[PDB]
């Protein structure tokens, strides 16, 4: 319901209900793990070799083929069963070459249920009776201060909840131009949210054809591992268009010169360092977690006067989402070549 002659002052940074969304999604994410299986008999001695591949001594194979003792459904008999993992999930314990999982000394990893998926669906947060929600419909609204055209609504619009560290996906596009937002510009410990108008199409794929293999842990307990790699052993990657990326970086340069004067030299360099999922951009392409290198994007300089950027990724199976002290999660392998099309909407 569009209002008249009204003006309220808003503040996105001291706002409530973003904390509530964070707590609700964390607790609901925890709630979809209790019916699923704990990998208690899986933290075990792993006899790993190199994956069968033409080995290059300068590079490294990103797959280790591990066979191990596993308990059958019967408590007396145990079997020898093999699987495939990445370098980023196993570590060498100290001739012989025996490995272990990286989470053997912090937590038992709850295996995610392969029935449930991780695609986003729009949640609308509706207010109870006696409360209302006000949305600001001003175009040039930098998210702080008085907005001149607000309108009340009973429920919010579609919020597809994405898990994206850098380069937020599937967002809400801006109206007519790029808009940068911050709590305090001269504060360099405050992140700057860039939301631009036209979306950037990004394709991402794993071209390696995998085989789901079931292993029986016990009665009613199934462990889904990687079987054979059908075809070529390739590196999973992503693509953006070169021209639209250069154009949109020109757009954010044009908008960034409003806050620092015109005669300013703006350059884009990659992330400085930290863990894996804060220096590289991480996302979830249909129940499969990619960690893609963004050095090919933020590599530019800007003076005050058909191709496509491909970028490689790494694939992890065990995750430590929200960095809890004792809560890790295995992710099951999924069949076939996996590709997804998404829209880069903004930057952090």
């Amino acid at each position, epitope marked *: 319901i569009h209002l008249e002659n009204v003006t309220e002052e808003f503040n996105m940074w001291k706002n409530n209900m973003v904390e509530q969304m964070h707590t609700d999604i964390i607790s609901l994410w925890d709630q979809s793990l209790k019916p699923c299986v704990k990998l208690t008999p899986l933290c075990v001695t792993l006899q790993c070799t190199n994956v069968t591949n*033409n080995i290059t001594d300068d590079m490294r194979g990103e797959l280790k083929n591990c066979s191990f003792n596993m308990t059958t459904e019967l408590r007396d008999k145990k079997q020898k069963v093999y699987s495939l993992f990445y370098r980023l999930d196993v570590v060498q314990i100290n001739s012989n070459k025996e490995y272990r999982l990286i989470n053997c000394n912090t937590s038992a990893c709850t295996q995610a249920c392969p029935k449930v998926s991780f695609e986003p669906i729009p949640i609308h947060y509706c207010a109870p009776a006696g409360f209302a929600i006000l949305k600001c419909k001003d175009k040039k609204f930098n998210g702080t201060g008085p907005c001149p055209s607000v309108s009340t609504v009973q429920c919010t619009h579609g919020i597809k909840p994405v898990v994206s560290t850098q380069l937020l996906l599937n967002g809400s596009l801006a109206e007519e131009e790029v808009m940068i937002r911050s709590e305090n510009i001269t504060n360099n410990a405050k992140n700057i949210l860039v939301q631009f108008n036209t979306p950037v199409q990004i394709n991402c794929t794993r071209p390696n054809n995998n085989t789901r293999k079931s292993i029986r842990i016990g009665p009613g307990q199934a462990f889904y591992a990687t079987g054979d790699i*059908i075809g070529d052993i390739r590196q999973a990657h992503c693509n953006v268009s070169k021209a639209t990326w250069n154009e949109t970086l020109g757009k954010v340069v044009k908008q960034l010169r409003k806050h620092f004067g015109n005669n300013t030299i703006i350059r884009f360099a990659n992330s400085s360092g930290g863990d894996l999922e804060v220096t590289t951009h991480s996302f979830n392409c249909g129940g499969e977690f990619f960690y893609c290198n963004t050095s090919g994007l933020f590599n530019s300089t800007w003076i005050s006067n058909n191709d496509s950027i*491909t970028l490689p990724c790494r694939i992890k199976q065990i995750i430590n989402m929200w960095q809890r002290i004792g809560q890790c999660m295995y992710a099951p392998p999924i069949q076939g070549v996996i590709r997804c099309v998404s829209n880069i909407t903004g930057l952090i």
Partner: antibody
Amino acid sequence: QVHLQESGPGLVKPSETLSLTCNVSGTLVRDNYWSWIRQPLGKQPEWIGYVHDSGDTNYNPSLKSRVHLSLDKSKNLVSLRLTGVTAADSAIYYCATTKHGRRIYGVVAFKEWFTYFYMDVWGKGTSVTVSS
Amino acid sequence: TFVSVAPGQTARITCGEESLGSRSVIWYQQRPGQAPSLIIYNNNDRPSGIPDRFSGSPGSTFGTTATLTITSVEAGDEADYYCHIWDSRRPTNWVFGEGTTLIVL
């Protein structure tokens, strides 16, 4: 038109350095790759390896030490030296030109391709035999 | 490895290990007493001098054997055949495959 011609001793005493030569006709040593291939009687051939200027001289890792390939740009020939002739070394040997070519299956920038070899023309052979 | 087909008919000669990934096969032939000679240098590519009807299995198939398809055979095709697979997963084959012989009526 190209045709090649080898030459050798034919009779070899054991534990002796074997050496073979390979003539040219038409195309010189600089214009193309070169290769040596050996084959015993009634057997499949064994590609010994390939030789070219600018370090393109990768050898069979089975032998890897007792065999050395070389060129002769002064006289425009190909040459091979062997070390430690055993009884298995009795075979007919071939110098032959070959051509490369990129088989590409994935991304070119991620080195998801390779270079295969194939010998278009061949020599005629030298029946090397080790005996005392 | 003895395959015989009364002349003018078709012919399928298999050779080598089963495929693992993408491959680049090379087919050579060998008359008795002669040097070898190239017939196929790619999965299905031939150079000049050798005619058609010597078709090859494409390397895009996963988990098959390399074949060599010959139609309208003759006494000139009576030779020893050899394969040289170049798989993108297996290492470099410094030796050839197994000798498959063709003989005609």
